[PDB]
Amino acid sequence: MTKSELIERLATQQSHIPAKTVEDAVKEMLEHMASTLAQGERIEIRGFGSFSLHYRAPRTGRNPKTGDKVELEGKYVPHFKPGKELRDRANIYG
DNA sequence: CCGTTTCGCTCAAGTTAGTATATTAAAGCTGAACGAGAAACGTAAAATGATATAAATATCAATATATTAAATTAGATTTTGCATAAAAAACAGACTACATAATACTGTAAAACACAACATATGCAGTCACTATGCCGAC
Numbered sequence: 001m002t003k004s005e006l007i008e009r010l011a012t013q014q015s016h017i018p019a020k021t022v023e024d025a026v027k028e029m030l031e032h033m034a035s036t037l038a039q040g041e042r043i044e045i046r047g048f049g050s051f052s053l054h055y056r057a058p059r060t061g062r063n064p065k066t067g068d069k070v071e072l073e074g075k076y077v078p079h080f081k082p083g084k085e086l087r088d089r090a091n092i093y094g
Numbered sequence: 095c096c097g098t099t100t101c102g103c104t105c106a107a108g109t110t111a112g113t114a115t116a117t118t119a120a121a122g123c124t125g126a127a128c129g130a131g132a133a134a135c136g137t138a139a140a141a142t143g144a145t146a147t148a149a150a151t152a153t154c155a156a157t158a159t160a161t162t163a164a165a166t167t168a169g170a171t172t173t174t175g176c177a178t179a180a181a182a183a184a185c186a187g188a189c190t191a192c193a194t195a196a197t198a199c200t201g202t203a204a205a206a207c208a209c210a211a212c213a214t215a216t217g218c219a220g221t222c223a224c225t226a227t228g229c230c231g232a233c
Binding site: 062 | 145146147149150151152162163164165233
């Protein structure tokens with residue numbers, strides 16, 4: 001399921017909703033979630049999950065191909081935490 | 095085995111047996127020319143799969159405790175569907191006033207052609223030549 005296939009299956013089910021409307025809606029939601037995480041704000045969707053931002057202290061990296069040294073500026077990285085409903089439904093085991 | 099004559103067949107000219115329609119009225123069929131929106135294609139560009147390794151970071155059970163997004167109300171209020179009715183403006187229903195065509199009637203020049211005596215070129219009336227083989231006569 002890609003970004004396009006996602007809009008396709010959502011437009012097929014929603015007949016009373018223009019296909020073009022669903023196409024833009026999906027693109028605006030993803031862009032809104034990507035912009036929020038950029039501003040430094042978290043995301044919390046009850047049932048789905050919750051996006052966060054974890055800090056990464058600056059450390060002297062090392063080229064994994066050769067083994068040299070490379071500086072690494074301190075930055076933040078997105079982190080998703082599956083919700084309760086998401087885990088239980090995605091968990092096929094016990 | 096082969097030939098000859100009768101018989102099954104079809105062409106050609108008489109002798110009988112059978113059935114009977116035209117216009118309205120309104121379609122119905124089908125070859126051929128006419129006029130846009132959406133998605134499968136494709137080359138090109140952007141994001142991602144490829145790839146590995148010691149060090150860095152996330153994986154998560156089991157429970158106490160402060161924190162918080164947010165559906166669940168619950169009461170407050172702009173928003174929304176629907177006329178009611180009068181102030182205000184549009185516009186037939188009247189009417190005289192005003193400028194304008196169809197018509198009423200007088201005033202005057204001149205178009206359009208018969209009628210009549212002449213004048214005369216031109217077509218018609220009457221006769222011979224132009225132009226070249228017939229007919230008749232010989233070969």
